[PDB]
Amino acid sequence: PQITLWQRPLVTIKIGGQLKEALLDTGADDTVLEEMSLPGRWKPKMITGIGGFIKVRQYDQILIEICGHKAIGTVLVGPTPVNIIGRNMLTQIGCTLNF
Amino acid sequence: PQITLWQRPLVTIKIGGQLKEALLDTGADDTVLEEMSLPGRWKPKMITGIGGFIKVRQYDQILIEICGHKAIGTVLVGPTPVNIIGRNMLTQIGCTLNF
Ligand SMILES: CC(C)(C)NC(=O)[C@@H]1C[C@@H]2CCCC[C@@H]2CN1C[C@@H](O)[C@H](Cc1ccccc1)NC(=O)[C@H](CC(N)=O)NC(=O)c1ccc2ccccc2n1
Numbered sequence: 001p002q003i004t005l006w007q008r009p010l011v012t013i014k015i016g017g018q019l020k021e022a023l024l025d026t027g028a029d030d031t032v033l034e035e036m037s038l039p040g041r042w043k044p045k046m047i048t049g050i051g052g053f054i055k056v057r058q059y060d061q062i063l064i065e066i067c068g069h070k071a072i073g074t075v076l077v078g079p080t081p082v083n084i085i086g087r088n089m090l091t092q093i094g095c096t097l098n099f
Numbered sequence: 100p101q102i103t104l105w106q107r108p109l110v111t112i113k114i115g116g117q118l119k120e121a122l123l124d125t126g127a128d129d130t131v132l133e134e135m136s137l138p139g140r141w142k143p144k145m146i147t148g149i150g151g152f153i154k155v156r157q158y159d160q161i162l163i164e165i166c167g168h169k170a171i172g173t174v175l176v177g178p179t180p181v182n183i184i185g186r187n188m189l190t191q192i193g194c195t196l197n198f
Contacts, residue, residue: 003196005186009125024196025126026108027183032149049149050131050179069198080149084126087104095198097102097123099168099189 001067002098013083014065022066022083024090026097031064031086032076038062045076054078069093100166101197112184113164114174119182121165125196127185130163131175137161146175153177168192 003009009024016037030047042057056078063072066085071092102108108123115136129146141156155177162171165184170191 001196001198005125005190005194005196008128008186009196023126025124026104026196027122027124027126029107047149048180050146050183051148051151051153054150067198087107090104093198095104095196097104097108097125097194098197099100099166099192099194 011067015062020083022085024095025084025086026090028084028086029088030076031073031089032056032078032080032084034080034083035077038077047076064089066093110166121182121184123189124183124185125189127183128187129175129185130172130183130188131155131177131179132182133179135176137174137176144175153179163188165192
């Protein structure tokens with residue numbers, strides 16, 4: 001698709017067969033998710049945003065479908081108000097910024 | 100241009116006649132820049148992202164060039180770790196997400 005930005009670029013994602021929605025976020029290095037059921041073990045990790053550091057749970061090799069495109073990588077579960085799809089995933093689905 | 104996301108989408112901006120660089124940030128509602136001099140009156144504001152709040156000064160109808168493209172809007176000045184260009188400005192230059 002070609003997505004304008006007059007509203008937040010939220011899209012449908014699928015993880016563990018669960019349908020969610022998430023923000024396509026070119027400003028985010030990592031992918032950070034709301035609480036949800038994920039397989040495997042996690043490890044504690046800390047990342048920062050504009051307001052400072054948070055503790056998150058790091059899951060590796062997670063499969064996700066983003067607006068129909070498959071991606072696999074590291075996802076961080078933590079105190080985020082919204083699922084955020086960061087560049088580690090965005091690149092896998094061929095996403096670009098255009099103007 | 101077309102900007103891939105293998106690295107941070109940083110671009111040149113010009114504001115207050117000064118050249119800086121900033122992050123093209125589709126996940127950000129607002130545009131937030133490091134401490135700097137701007138004209139007019141400001142209003143105090145608090146914004147959030149991941150990790151909590153920061154206090155900023157809000158300036159309205161500020162002129163900025165983004166990669167040579169003119170935009171006018173609200174700029175928030177404060178202790179952000181990185182200059183970020185949010186959707187309020189990105190929309191003025193016709194920026195889209197494409198995959
Ligand atoms: C996700 C993580 C890996 C933590 N990366 C980010 O946090 C990086 C960090 C880099 C340096 C510090 C400054 C931000 C740049 C950008 N951000 C991504 C960046 O895209 C971040 C993503 C976002 C969506 C909303 C909720 C939180 C997170 N957006 C932002 O921080 C901007 C700040 C701003 N006023 O515009 N926040 C939002 O526009 C914002 C939106 C609505 C809100 C609702 C509830 C909660 C918090 C609220 N957040």
